[PDB]
Amino acid sequence: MQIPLCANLVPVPITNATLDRITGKWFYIASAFRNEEYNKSVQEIQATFFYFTPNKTEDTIFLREYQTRQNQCFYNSSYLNVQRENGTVSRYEGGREHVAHLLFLRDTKTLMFGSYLDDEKNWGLSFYADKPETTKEQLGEFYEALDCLRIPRSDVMYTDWKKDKCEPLEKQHEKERKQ
């Protein structure tokens, strides 16, 4: 395995410090995959921001996702399961449990999810940050991770924060949960 090139693609067991690190609000920035299904489906996502509340005693994360797709907001919450040893996270989408490797970069205000990382025919990365806009410093780290997987930068699908439809609903939820 080529290092430093692939340094950040390397899984490590998930600790409580790591769970704390990913706690809070995240914005989905960019992704790329060799999997063709994810290429056509992720292409429809205009924005997404979500909340992670990990439960360190249960190895779960409570997710509250706010996805913008088809000119509308789609809200869903669920309990993700954490597989500490394998450095992975899992959730149910469309009936089936799906797994993602939890990965990181130099900047702690960012994180990645790795999909099908064992399979060079299907692998991909999704890129997340604490703001909907990222710096060239932050981007560089993600683009490097794509270089590791030999995925062209041209294959990246990007969000556009101005197209978000979920902010007004998140606003409504804040009102409800703080009442």
* 50 contributes a contact to ligand Z80 by CB under 6 A: yes
* 109 contributes a contact to ligand Z80 by CB under 6 A: no
Residue 110 DSSP class: E
CB of 114 to ligand Z80, least distance (A): 9
* 91 contributes a contact to ligand Z80 by CB under 6 A: yes
* 105 contributes a contact to ligand Z80 by CB under 6 A: no
- Residue number with CB closer to ligand Z80 (80 or 117): 80
CB of 126 to ligand Z80, least distance (A): 5
* 28 contributes a contact to ligand Z80 by CB under 6 A: yes
- Residue number with CB closer to ligand Z80 (63 or 169): 63
Three-state secondary structure call for residue 98: strand
* 126 contributes a contact to ligand Z80 by CB under 6 A: yes
Q: Which stretch binds ligand Z80 (CB under 6 A): 12-20, 96-104, 162-170, 171-179?
A: 96-104
Please count the CA atoms within 13 angstroms of the CA of 158 that sit on its side-chain side.
Answer: 11
* 90 contributes a contact to ligand Z80 by CB under 6 A: yes
Residues 145 and 7 sit within 8 Å (Cβ to Cβ): no
**If you write DSSP's letter for every residue of 46-89 in order, what string do you get?**
EEEEEEEEEETTTTEEEEEEEEEETTEEEEEEEEEEEETTTTEE
Residue 153 DSSP class: G
| Burial (CB count <10 Å: 0-12, 13-18, 19+), residue 179 | exposed
* 142 contributes a contact to ligand Z80 by CB under 6 A: no
Distance CA 89, CA 101 (A): 6
Query: Which uninterrupted H or E stretch holds 174?
Result: helix 167-177
Total number of residues that touch ligand Z80 (CB under 6 A): 17
* 18 contributes a contact to ligand Z80 by CB under 6 A: no
* 106 contributes a contact to ligand Z80 by CB under 6 A: no
Which spans of this chain sit near ligand Z80 (rule: CB under 6 A)?
A: 28, 38, 42, 48, 50, 63, 65, 80, 89-91, 98-100, 113, 115, 126
